[PDB]
């Protein structure tokens, strides 16, 4: 019974509640599908946002996910790095999975494609 962190990153086009929730939802949906994540196997989720996002906690998006009511989630501010990607939401989901470490599916969407390791 092993555990793995699963990362995701995305961006919003503006700091509005609809955009923050929709983009966070889309990122979570991709993490969940690609890693076949059962909510009952999720230890916890962390979600960071850059300090230019104030409209809504990205964690509220989890309310839209059937079966995820009891998955603990909390947020944190991301560092403000010169040249860092603006309006960026990052997920670190801790899942009970037996997949080999190198075979975990980390997800980069929207402008956060630019953070994908192979593009560095």
């Amino acid at each position: 019974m092993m555990f793995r962190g699963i990362r995701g990153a995305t961006t919003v086009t503006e700091d509005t509640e609809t955009e923050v929730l929709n983009k966070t939802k889309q990122l979570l949906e991709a993490i969940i599908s690609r890693n076949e994540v059962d909510p009952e196997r999720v230890v916890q989720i962390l979600i960071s946002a850059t300090q230019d996002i104030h409209s809504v906690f990205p964690a509220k998006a989890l309310r839209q996910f059937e079966g995820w009511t009891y998955v603990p989630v909390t947020c944190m501010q991301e560092l403000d790095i010169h040249g860092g990607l603006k309006h960026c939401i990052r997920v670190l989901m801790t899942v009970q999975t037996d997949t080999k470490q190198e075979d975990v599916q980390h997800v980069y969407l929207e402008e956060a494609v630019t953070l994908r390791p192979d593009l560095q």
Copy 2:
């Protein structure tokens, strides 16, 4: 065994070390008691605070729990969300437990009772 995150949240009325530590201690005490948490089964603890809290690291409250000296804890700044609860301290404790996900008892105290689902 399985592992589970346990959430808590509380608030203080002012940014003082006494209030931050007292309220953080009371929140941790409730998490620990209601979930029968032994320190050796705690992987780690994260504690966030809103950016109106500068008085003390909430992690210092662990000094009041005998046997918790070596439980790793680190802090982080919570997002500043318009309309979000002010002076708010949030805990995420990761614990070895076979308790079913829906039976883990998360704890919301003080003005953070408004945050409970």
Copy 3:
């Protein structure tokens, strides 16, 4: 099999990329060596920095570690505590290890040496 957080802390003399990366690398190297950490056993890593560090994400230092390219890592902002250490980088590495809680070797370097828990 048990899981344990391993903490570290260090400081930088200036907010410049190569200083931040080298200090973070040195802290990670010490955590890894002293705890004999196999990357494949690491669930995830968090690295925080105080609000006076803007030059680079400390997490970029992990790219310098052969064998660690699949370890997930992300950053966050540390609280700004009056009397807290300035220019401070902190690590929380979550490792699958059966080592007893009191035997884990948490690492405190540079100006952060007095932050160790039992002090």
